[PDB]
Design a protein around this ligand. Sequence first.
Ligand code: SAH
Length: 270
Amino acid sequence: MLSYRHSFHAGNHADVLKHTVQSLIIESLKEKDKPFLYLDTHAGAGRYQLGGKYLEGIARIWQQDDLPAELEAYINVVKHFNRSGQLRYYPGSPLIARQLLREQDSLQLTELHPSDYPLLRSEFQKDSRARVEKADGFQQLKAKLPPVSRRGLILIDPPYEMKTDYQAVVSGIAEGYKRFATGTYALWYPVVLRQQIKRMIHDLEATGIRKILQIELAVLPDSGMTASGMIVINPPWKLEQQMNNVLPWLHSKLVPAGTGHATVSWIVPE
Ligand SMILES: Nc1ncnc2c1ncn2[C@@H]1O[C@H](CSCC[C@H](N)C(=O)O)[C@@H](O)[C@H]1O
């Protein structure tokens, strides 16, 4: 295992949707002064040298003059790592959180790949808010929850290299939710095999967990990876409307020909 490297995919359309949603959840959590935890089970290397799927993702939005307000926090982090105006580095989920989180907040990050873990550690060598471990991310849903702050965003973002991930994300969410039922859980998934995503969502419904939102962006109709999504348990109350505001613009820029779709809907509605 562990042959996947996120550097091959960083900044693609999936990362754009994923990090849009991650950023909006973090900004909502920051509306209250009380600290919160950011927990990243499959954290990656931290930052990625781009120079090419990023050309069809982040490159198509980060310098647009009419950037929706819902993208400003995210795109400002991307600009922070590229102040020359040239697209050279892409900040992964840990660096988006590192820049958006406040002094009082905490980060718990895990990465198993033996070359990418040390790169991730280096990004946080002077940041006492963060802990970085070379450990199984699914175990952290038991070990690190609930946070003492009793507030948090948990991002579960595996590569689905091992087909066991389709079941492990549901089991892992169930274990995390048992320990921390008020947290916001954001699960990223690819659409390579639609029926396996339907199977996964069926298993998730069967847990009995309520308030489950689904955000999906497809660059092509169902048929490699044609789409990806974010399943969000306990979304901030504004998230659905924020996505209805921003998904049409996002899909039109990421997919100029109009193929595919961009939807927000409920798996388990209120
Ligand atoms: N069991 C496991 N525990 C922790 N990390 C794992 C894992 N299995 C695979 N990985 C790592 O999971 C990552 C998925 S890509 C993660 C990207 C990151 N969240 C971002 O948005 O920037 C890869 O870096 C891979 O090495």
